[PDB]
Write a protein that binds this ligand. Structure first.
Ligand code: FAD
Ligand code: FAD
Ligand code: 3J8
Lengths: 461, 461
């Protein structure tokens, strides 16, 4: 049995970051990866998604050419052109992350790892065993699909995984789900010319976000040509001559349930959740604790219930973001290999961007969350809504909405929420300020940058 | 003589903001304006500049259409189309600012004000006199042009003022100056198809900015097709058959001076400085103090040397930005009309964006400024340079450069400097953090937003 200081299962965001930082501290480390380095984000996540978003963004701005004094464009978007370049870029990234490991002198173990029943924590890959005083589980998750038993034909639909295998633009797309991935997918497919529907269980998307964002994002989706099918879910999917037929039930409150057949669907995309990647880890061989969804349970230091075994990232089911897996991974490395006992990730005030159109930026508590935590008497929100001067000369419009959530007498900024042009690049700095415990006076004492959208956040009244 | 609590000379950024805030505090206020409300920013500054920048940005991104799988565009940009819409937008803004005053119950006095010799501070407009215990001078400035005596034919050139009167795209443009206005003008004219030169006295533009920015911006200008004429200045301008001939002298260090004639120039644009608007104020009638350039001298509370007379904004020659005039104006209002004796503008850590291509964002001290202030032993800078993943699929490239300047053991962030896509909307939040006295750990403790350019500022090493 080959022994290391650090065995890391999964060469994705969390695994790579943690192994690399451990190695910097002197650890003899190995990374196990059954597929491609970079994991979900690089291969079927953040990176390819962003490239597709950028493409969609081009399509959106192109509508404004004539308004800006430019001749109109020629017609045909070509999905295949961007797909090939996206693929190549992902390949470049894979090669880069492989090299990062090697130059870090981190061993790369190719294959699927599973734990053994061996007393001291030990894994097996392709018949070979490996052990370490410290084993990180960073296996991530994967897209959820409905069982055939619940929804006959569901397997005819694809997921975000399949999305990145698409070779052509689907003529007609139905996206099922109301979370950020669903929204991003629908927004991209629609902007690029797919006749797109987004099917949601209630009245708005992003219901976990601040209500202003939930409302605005749903509206902007509709304004952009995305058909939002409210209080609707899939009952069955059937293969037809032209593509797929989606039978859905719509049950709007105050109305009667009605079943509708959606014909001629080229692409049915399930975006209804992620399942952790733990099924084949043989976690039970060591009594490693999971929840009923298969998420690995950890304390605030990413410890599992078993000594010498840790978990970070999507596999733990909390804040499923690349930078979060990375930060928890690095904090863990510092704790184990720099003996910083207090080293852990603070899961409060993690910023998120949703790449809708326009993009969404959020950090901290929703207004409701603040209300519950501080008391309605101790929360004061400031908000504004405007049309960015970018649109001063266009017939097409998007809105910018901003909300600042303040708590207590000092008006501590405990939440910032926004959607609008530039909001994707706008958030990071404000997240630093919020992390620092900025009050509203801190914002107001900061001189504005004009003319930008961002200045509106430091001149709210 | 009509008496008020507050007489404000100039209905621009600083004047409007100060009068409006005074009025909120109950002041009986009047604003004198000889031309259009909104002053320089609305009429011949920030707003129209930004619209033109947005137009130029379209042109830049259009080069990337085919790379993103879109058909190429048709050819002819039409300046006249955007000019008309820009003009209309400026007209809407004028009407808005007029209305803001009226709804604030601020009297609008149309005409040119000048002080009288009357003992108690009094102004005259169109033969009528007005007085107040508090008179704000907020007259702004105007573009500098060389005297014919120094440069024969200089009056054949225009300034940024003339820029916004242009009805067509000049075929050939020469911009003289190295500051942000020069850079923005050249960048816009060039992006829109003008054969553009930018003539600078030394080797780089923006020499007052951090050296990284000065260097990068000069390079990006060249990469974008702007001819940067280094160590060059105009000796004479002559009207020719086709347009203008610009005779310039170039004196590169280590070389001999050489005179070059630039023929067929349609647009020669002077952007070599701003002169304060004080010449016809009859400041001498009250002994109001100015410098040799005509700037009104003030203390930290915007007091002139004369009791009951104040000045804010470009007329004082310090930090010539709209948000600065606004903030100094409002702080002044609070001091005078809410009796907040400590109310004043902090002129440190004012953020600036330069709308080059890509945009520049800066706040705090350059590296050299930090070095001088803290000692080279007490300054640590972090920097990075990358190509934004937006360009992962394009043949055209721009860079993103970021520098964080840290001082002392705590590594207080005393400067942030950057150029790159999205940097215009990125800066504001970081400016709030820097104002708060953020250290590098504050940045590093902030979870990244991925994939963005902005995340690079919280993961510098
Ligand atoms: C469509 C989509 C878009 C997204 N966009 C963003 C975004 O814009 N910004 C953002 O912050 N996040 C985004 N995410 C989230 C993101 O990608 C994840 O949060 C991230 O990948 C989690 O890191 P991880 O290390 O936990 O898991 P992963 O990055 O998925 O890596 C886990 C790895 O372990 C391997 N593996 C699993 N089991 C084993 C085993 N038994 N043996 C050996 N190897 C194994 C896998 O093959 C894989 O490479 C997106 C996700 C999706 C699906
Ligand atoms: C081309 C250009 C682009 C710019 N872009 C930006 C930018 O993107 N961001 C930014 O923060 N700043 C920008 N600026 C700077 C900006 O516009 C000024 O800093 C701002 O206008 C200053 O405010 P002010 O109140 O001091 O002067 P002004 O806004 O110029 O207002 C002064 C006013 O007083 C009036 N006036 C003058 N004398 C008298 C008198 N004797 N009697 C009656 N009325 C009088 C004038 O007609 C005028 O309306 C730009 C400037 C230029 C020239
Ligand atoms: C931010 N931005 C873009 C981002 C990505 C792709 C574009 O094509 C684009 N075009 C633009 C046009 C005008 C103003 C901004 C713009």
């Amino acid at each position: 049995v080959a022994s290391y200081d650090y065995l890391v299962i999964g060469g994705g965001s969390g695994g790579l970051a943690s192994a690399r930082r451990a190695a910097e501290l002197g650890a003899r480390a190995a990374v196990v990866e059954s597929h491609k380095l970079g994991g979900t984000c690089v291969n079927v996540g953040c990176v390819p998604k962003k490239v597709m978003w950028n493409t969609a963004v081009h399509s959106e701005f192109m509508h404004d050419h004539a308004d800006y004094g430019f001749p109109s464009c020629e017609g045909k978007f070509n999905w295949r052109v961007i797909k090939e370049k996206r693929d190549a870029y992902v390949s470049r990234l894979n090669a880069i992350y492989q090299n990062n490991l090697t130059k870090s002198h981190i061993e790369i173990i190719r294959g699927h790892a599973a734990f053994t029943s061996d007393p001291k924590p030990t894994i097996e890959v392709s018949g070979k065993k490996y052990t370490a005083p410290h084993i990180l589980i960073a296996t991530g998750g994967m897209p959820s699909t409905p069982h055939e038993s619940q929804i006959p034909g569901a397997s005819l639909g694809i997921t975000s995984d399949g999305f990145f295998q698409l070779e052509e633009l689907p003529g007609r797309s139905v996206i099922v789900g109301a979370g950020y991935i669903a929204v991003e997918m629908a927004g991209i497919l629609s902007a690029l010319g797919s006749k797109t529907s987004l099917m949601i269980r209630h009245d708005k998307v992003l219901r976990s976000f601040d209500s202003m964002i939930s409302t605005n994002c749903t509206e902007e989706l509709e304004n952009a040509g995305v058909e939002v099918l409210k209080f609707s879910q899939v009952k069955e999917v059937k293969k037809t001559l032209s593509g797929l037929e989606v039978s859905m039930v719509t049950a709007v409150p105050g109305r009667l349930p009605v079943m509708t057949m959606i014909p001629d669907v080229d692409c049915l995309l399930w975006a209804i959740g992620r399942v952790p990647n733990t099924k084949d880890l043989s976690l039970n061989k060591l009594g490693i604790q999971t929840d009923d969804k298969g998420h690995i349970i950890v304390d605030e230091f990413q410890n599992t219930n078993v000594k010498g075994i840790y978990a970070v990232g999507d596999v733990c089911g909390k804040a499923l973001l690349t930078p979060v897996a990375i930060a928890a991974g690095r904090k863990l490395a510092h704790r184990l290999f720099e003996y910083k006992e207090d080293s852990k990730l603070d899961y409060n005030n993690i910023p998120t961007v949703v790449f809708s159109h326009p993009p969404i930026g959020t950090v901290g508590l929703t207004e409701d969350e603040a209300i519950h935590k501080y008391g309605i008497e101790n929360v004061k929100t400031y908000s504004t809504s405007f049309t960015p001067m970018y649109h001063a000369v266009t017939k097409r419009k998007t809105k910018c909405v901003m909300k600042m959530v303040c708590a207590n007498k000092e008006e501590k900024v405990v939440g910032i929420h926004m959607q609008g042009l530039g909001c994707d690049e706008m958030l990071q700095g404000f997240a630093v300020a919020v992390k620092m415990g900025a009050t509203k006076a801190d914002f107001d004492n900061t001189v504005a940058i004009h003319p930008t959208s961002s200045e509106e956040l430091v001149t709210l009244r």
